[PDB]
Amino acid sequence: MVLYFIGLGLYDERDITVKGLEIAKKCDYVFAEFYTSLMAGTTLGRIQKLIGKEIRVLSREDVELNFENIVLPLAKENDVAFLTPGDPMVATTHAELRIRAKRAGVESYVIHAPSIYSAVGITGLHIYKFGKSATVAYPEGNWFPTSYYDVIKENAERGLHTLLFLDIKAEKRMYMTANEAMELLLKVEDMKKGGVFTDDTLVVVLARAGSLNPTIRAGYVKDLIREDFGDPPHILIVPGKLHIVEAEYLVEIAGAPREILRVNV
Amino acid sequence: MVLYFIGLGLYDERDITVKGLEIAKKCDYVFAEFYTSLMAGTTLGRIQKLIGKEIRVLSREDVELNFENIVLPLAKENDVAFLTPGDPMVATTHAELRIRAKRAGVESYVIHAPSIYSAVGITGLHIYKFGKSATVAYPEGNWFPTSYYDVIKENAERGLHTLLFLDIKAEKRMYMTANEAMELLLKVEDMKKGGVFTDDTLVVVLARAGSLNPTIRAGYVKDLIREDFGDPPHILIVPGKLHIVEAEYLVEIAGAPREILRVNV
Ligand SMILES: Nc1ncnc2c1ncn2[C@@H]1O[C@H](CSCC[C@H](N)C(=O)O)[C@@H](O)[C@H]1O
């Protein structure tokens, strides 16, 4: 009679919480989805081994179109687990899955896990200063989306930081790199000439958050655009005006140039 | 010679990530602070019991003034862990402690844990729609903080949600409730009269996130300002313009007035 939404965390199989692991182990059935994001530091096999249960993977269509036919049925007579990367309820479409549960007379509970939204705190940037968040999407054929650019403008304009999620073709396991995101933004800047993202813009790159050895680099676009940040996933952030303490952290921990202490504070 | 900042999560000792628990079990010395946030569903004993190590709790002064004299000295010859509620780098000044570690020649690593900053996703409000965050601080003597009121105004102007961390004086065992924060907000409104926070403002209250049964309520201030949301901690959220799906969730899961379903696009 119970459905558990369990977050898997940031990077590998150990990023699930103890509560999530113990509950998953007591569930009769375990489903998982890997279309909203991926666990770059592990595999389905390793998560299955840790949980000690077979995991039925579900596609986007499986969830969005048939969640009530695939998952909820079993939940009326058993304890069922639905695993997702990061924190459940963060992916925009997940919240309403709880409404489907209710509609089906099934109780659901949420077991949280770390998310990039909170994990960026490791960049030394104050979490309260982040504004609206966005996703950098790959242009396609005749489609060139650029709203993520306006989000940066509106946030920076108020001295707020902008968290940028990079495009990901989950199924094909293809990640957009920080380097590509930067190239895209420069191209958008050249189209909109808003002086929002240039070679002089200060940016922060966070790669493999959750790993014990993530890549945290801060610097100007002209210098980082061709730098190697390692394996995915990459998260790009365009900081607003910095507080001296934020700049000190970026310099001492993220290898940023001393120059930011006078130019970006 | 390493220092590990390990998050313990939102509510109880099991909100720690498996990664965090396994590393903590192997640390020679374990320190912790419980003043930046309240873990309502556990005790020091249960945490010590789970980690299998004796935990020395530090006060704000111990950390902010003597971290490099109490903790760092040991991380020079041993593996040391510093535990905190939620995520160690979120809405705290703990990030600066990594700088102290560096200058003391100590390597530090961060292990994330579920945070209230991302757990807000459970309210059904799109997390990418949250703007600048702020804290409702207790008035002290003749000093009456109000900056958080302007944060709400700015976000609302842009149609963004506002996350309000509530004040806490752990030493006095004081935990600001959503009701108290609402009372303070109404008083600020009388003074500034910006039409930002009134009896008719729609708010969302999340209490004891991370527990299996948190309290999630949405409604007008006039009806919620005297409602009992249970034991702390509580966060208050002032939504911006709602998407239809956000409203449906607030009504279906948070018991909001069925009338907010009618959005004035
Ligand atoms: N489980 C919980 N439920 C509701 N609010 C919570 C909460 N945990 C923390 N908070 C809120 O956040 C404030 C502390 S701010 C420190 C937050 C912490 N680093 C984290 O990652 O969560 C509290 O006063 C409270 O208003």
Swiss-Prot record, chains A, B:
<comment type="similarity">
    <text>Belongs to the diphthine synthase family.</text>
</comment>
<dbReference type="Pfam" id="PF00590">
    <property type="entry name" value="TP_methylase"/>
</dbReference>
<feature type="binding site">
    <location>
        <position position="166"/>
    </location>
    <ligand>
        <name>S-adenosyl-L-methionine</name>
    </ligand>
</feature>
<dbReference type="InterPro" id="IPR014777">
    <property type="entry name" value="4pyrrole_Mease_sub1"/>
</dbReference>
<comment type="subunit">
    <text>Homodimer.</text>
</comment>
<dbReference type="InterPro" id="IPR014776">
    <property type="entry name" value="4pyrrole_Mease_sub2"/>
</dbReference>
<keyword id="KW-0949">S-adenosyl-L-methionine</keyword>
<feature type="binding site">
    <location>
        <position position="87"/>
    </location>
    <ligand>
        <name>S-adenosyl-L-methionine</name>
    </ligand>
</feature>
<dbReference type="InterPro" id="IPR035996">
    <property type="entry name" value="4pyrrol_Methylase_sf"/>
</dbReference>
<dbReference type="GO" id="GO:0004164">
    <property type="term" value="F:diphthine synthase activity"/>
</dbReference>
<dbReference type="InterPro" id="IPR004551">
    <property type="entry name" value="Dphthn_synthase"/>
</dbReference>
<keyword id="KW-0489">Methyltransferase</keyword>
<comment type="function">
    <text>S-adenosyl-L-methionine-dependent methyltransferase that catalyzes the trimethylation of the amino group of the modified target histidine residue in translation elongation factor 2 (EF-2), to form an intermediate called diphthine. The three successive methylation reactions represent the second step of diphthamide biosynthesis.</text>
</comment>
<keyword id="KW-0808">Transferase</keyword>
<dbReference type="GO" id="GO:0017183">
    <property type="term" value="P:protein histidyl modification to diphthamide"/>
</dbReference>
<dbReference type="InterPro" id="IPR000878">
    <property type="entry name" value="4pyrrol_Mease"/>
</dbReference>
<feature type="binding site">
    <location>
        <begin position="115"/>
        <end position="116"/>
    </location>
    <ligand>
        <name>S-adenosyl-L-methionine</name>
    </ligand>
</feature>
<comment type="pathway">
    <text>Protein modification; peptidyl-diphthamide biosynthesis.</text>
</comment>
<feature type="binding site">
    <location>
        <position position="90"/>
    </location>
    <ligand>
        <name>S-adenosyl-L-methionine</name>
    </ligand>
</feature>
<feature type="binding site">
    <location>
        <position position="234"/>
    </location>
    <ligand>
        <name>S-adenosyl-L-methionine</name>
    </ligand>
</feature>
<feature type="binding site">
    <location>
        <position position="10"/>
    </location>
    <ligand>
        <name>S-adenosyl-L-methionine</name>
    </ligand>
</feature>
<dbReference type="GO" id="GO:0032259">
    <property type="term" value="P:methylation"/>
</dbReference>
<protein>
    <recommendedName>
        <fullName>Diphthine synthase</fullName>
        <ecNumber>2.1.1.98</ecNumber>
    </recommendedName>
</protein>
<feature type="binding site">
    <location>
        <position position="209"/>
    </location>
    <ligand>
        <name>S-adenosyl-L-methionine</name>
    </ligand>
</feature>
